Amino acid sequence: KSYTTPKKNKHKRKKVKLAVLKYYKVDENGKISRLRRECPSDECGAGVFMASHFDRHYCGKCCLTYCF
Amino acid sequence: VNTALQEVLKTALIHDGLARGIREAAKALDKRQAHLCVLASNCDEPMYVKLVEALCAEHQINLIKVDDNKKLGEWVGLCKIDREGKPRKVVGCSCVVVKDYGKESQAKDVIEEYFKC
Ligand SMILES: [Zn+2]
Known about the structure:
This is part of a larger assembly, with chains A and B. Chain A is largely without helices or strands. Chain A has no helices and two strands. Chain A has strands spanning 56-58, 65-67. Chain A has a two-stranded antiparallel sheet. By secondary structure, chain B is mostly helical. Chain B has one domain: CATH 3.30.1330.30. Chain B has helices spanning 2-15, 22-30, 48-56, 108-116, and strands at residues 36-39, 95-98. Zinc ion (ZN) binds next to loops of chain A. The site of zinc ion has 8 residues of chain A, from loops. The PDB classes it as ribosome.
């Protein structure tokens, strides 16, 4: 049943409520001015959102990390 | 209007042409695919009312007003566990957009006649 080495947990995804509010920035106007950019590759759709990082910009399902 | 909307959502669930979910609604809005939607206004939403009205009145999307959001999850049938009874282990939904394929129905014609006028 139990073992000696401690079991490392599998990365269960966290619980975030109303997440879309930090993706589409809410300005004064009713325009969806989103700071998250758009992936120029046509293999992935425009809906499929990318990754937001600090020294790079990983794309969607294209597996192309558009670094600086 | 009630039987028409229930039958339209029923046949949309039959054909599975609806992209349910706020995320897939954002996919359809960014991909410019929006005909009609279901919305519940004046709820206990702390910030979401302005956001959903901003994403609704931006790209000619239909408007409908429902009282609260926790009963919105019964039209599309989210938590229909034990269908032989009133569902009880249910959470609600914010909005459901439907890309309708079976658009021709019994009274959706006069619903869109109201919508266009
Ligand atoms: Zn891409």
